[PDB]
Write an enzyme that holds these catalytic residues in place. Sequence first.
Site, PDB file in Angstrom:
ATOM      1  N   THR A  11      26.977  48.229   2.414  1.00 32.31           N
ATOM      2  CA  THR A  11      26.708  46.796   2.403  1.00 32.31           C
ATOM      3  C   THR A  11      25.327  46.503   1.825  1.00 32.31           C
ATOM      4  O   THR A  11      24.323  47.043   2.291  1.00 32.31           O
ATOM      5  CB  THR A  11      26.801  46.191   3.820  1.00 32.31           C
ATOM      6  OG1 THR A  11      28.151  46.273   4.293  1.00 32.31           O
ATOM      7  CG2 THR A  11      26.366  44.736   3.810  1.00 32.31           C
ATOM      8  N   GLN A  12      25.284  45.646   0.804  1.00 31.20           N
ATOM      9  CA  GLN A  12      24.024  45.248   0.187  1.00 31.20           C
ATOM     10  C   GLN A  12      23.523  43.892   0.662  1.00 31.20           C
ATOM     11  O   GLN A  12      22.310  43.659   0.653  1.00 31.20           O
ATOM     12  CB  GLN A  12      24.160  45.235  -1.339  1.00 31.20           C
ATOM     13  CG  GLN A  12      24.374  46.614  -1.941  1.00 31.20           C
ATOM     14  CD  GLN A  12      23.283  47.596  -1.552  1.00 31.20           C
ATOM     15  OE1 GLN A  12      22.109  47.238  -1.473  1.00 31.20           O
ATOM     16  NE2 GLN A  12      23.669  48.840  -1.298  1.00 31.20           N
TER      17      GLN A  12
ATOM     18  N   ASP B  71      31.240  45.607   8.715  1.00 30.70           N
ATOM     19  CA  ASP B  71      30.622  46.844   9.182  1.00 30.70           C
ATOM     20  C   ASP B  71      30.856  47.055  10.671  1.00 30.70           C
ATOM     21  O   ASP B  71      31.024  48.195  11.118  1.00 30.70           O
ATOM     22  CB  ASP B  71      29.124  46.831   8.880  1.00 30.70           C
ATOM     23  CG  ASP B  71      28.825  46.896   7.397  1.00 30.70           C
ATOM     24  OD1 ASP B  71      29.763  47.157   6.612  1.00 30.70           O
ATOM     25  OD2 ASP B  71      27.651  46.683   7.017  1.00 30.70           O
TER      26      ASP B  71
ATOM     27  N   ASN C 270      22.489  52.610   1.514  1.00 30.79           N
ATOM     28  CA  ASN C 270      23.698  51.798   1.671  1.00 30.79           C
ATOM     29  C   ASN C 270      23.937  51.579   3.155  1.00 30.79           C
ATOM     30  O   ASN C 270      24.817  52.198   3.765  1.00 30.79           O
ATOM     31  CB  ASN C 270      24.906  52.467   1.013  1.00 30.79           C
ATOM     32  CG  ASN C 270      26.171  51.647   1.150  1.00 30.79           C
ATOM     33  OD1 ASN C 270      26.123  50.424   1.285  1.00 30.79           O
ATOM     34  ND2 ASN C 270      27.315  52.319   1.120  1.00 30.79           N
TER      35      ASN C 270
END
Lengths: 233, 243
Positions: free
Chosen positions: A1-2, A59, A108
């Site tokens: 996830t950015q 997430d 990441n």
Amino acid sequence: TQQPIVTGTSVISMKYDNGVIIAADNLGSYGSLLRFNGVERLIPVGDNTVVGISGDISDMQHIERLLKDLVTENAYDNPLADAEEALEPSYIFEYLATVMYQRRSKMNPLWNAIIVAGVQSNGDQFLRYVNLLGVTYSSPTLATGFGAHMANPLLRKVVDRESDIPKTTVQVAEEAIVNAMRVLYYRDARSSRNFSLAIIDKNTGLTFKKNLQVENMKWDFAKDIKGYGTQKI
Amino acid sequence: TGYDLSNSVFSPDGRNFQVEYAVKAVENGTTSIGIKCNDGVVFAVEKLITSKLLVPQKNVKIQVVDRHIGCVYSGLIPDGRHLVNRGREEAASFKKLYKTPIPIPAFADRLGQYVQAHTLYNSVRPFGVSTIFGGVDKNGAHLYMLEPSGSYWGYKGAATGKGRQSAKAELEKLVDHHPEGLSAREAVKQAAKIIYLAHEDNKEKDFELEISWCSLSETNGLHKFVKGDLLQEAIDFAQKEIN
């Protein structure tokens, strides 16, 4: 996830004489859009652990699947998976924390803040934090996001140091948790009125309360607020 | 000549002799059985006590796959552990991709394709185990048996090991006498009886009975080992049934 998309706000928790308490609202936000309700952000593991997660919801669901597979794996070839070789809160924490720091180091991250709360096999209270950076710390009170700014000041007036933990009853701690949830609903613009609360007691086990609601709110004084300075009507 | 020296080689009859030698290795092993009941399956196995230095109730033989599958095997035990590890990988992959736990026929075909692939090259040895497995899925109870050749079928009852023949005889009796089907507890009792009966081929050594079951009503679709009072009840049933 950015960058996070669907997010969940504060997760609050504290220790008391016979266990731990942890709570979180049932909201999944989409920026400034309060998109999803009924989103359970407390993941119970076993009869002795609850994992409160805030941040990117995808997430969080990935972490849910991870914990599910971890329980399944610990069951394998383990005749004591329900006794001496059952999953401990410290095991689940250390695993999640290893994962968080490895994801941060691989550039990441899992865009989350996590509080693992439970009771060890010997009766000790476990309450520890880990976030998307791999940072870990432990305290009698633990909160993420806005909770850290507002829940902790309140909850710390009950358990200011370790010595206050035996003096604190489960009723006092649950009252403090519910009051902090009300304060967050007052002042957090990404919060919900509905929340879930879990108690991990070394005698009564895991108590999981869903569909709770903020009650006894003070709103009457709003009628006496006119304008923003000189206005009288 | 020399057709049996290399795996995956066809003999002039069309046989793979290395698979048959693995089958001999299987037949050398202890007896293990499975019985399909009305809403689940039961697995049973005999464990020879070579010496009283062995810790009783330890040295568990039956393995669990996912949370609903039970597997037992006769033959080379480490080969069975290898097969169970591969099956656990397969079930985990299936669940990760499709969310739902792997159905029992799907898991059966996973194991079967693996064992069959282990008969395609001369660089690998066939599995020296026969595997009885199964459990409860959205379509009910399923019991399967898988041979070293990769062949596998679904069974009302299955048995392998040195005492497989008497076990199959008793299973055919149970099938003929109960067209309606057995209940999970009755199936546990009958598995205990069949294990005690098939033990006569290893009569010179003591044996320990190990039972597990996966029943939709008795275990809520999950794999659980039969221990404690129920295990002792099955043991007593078998004891007073051999007389």
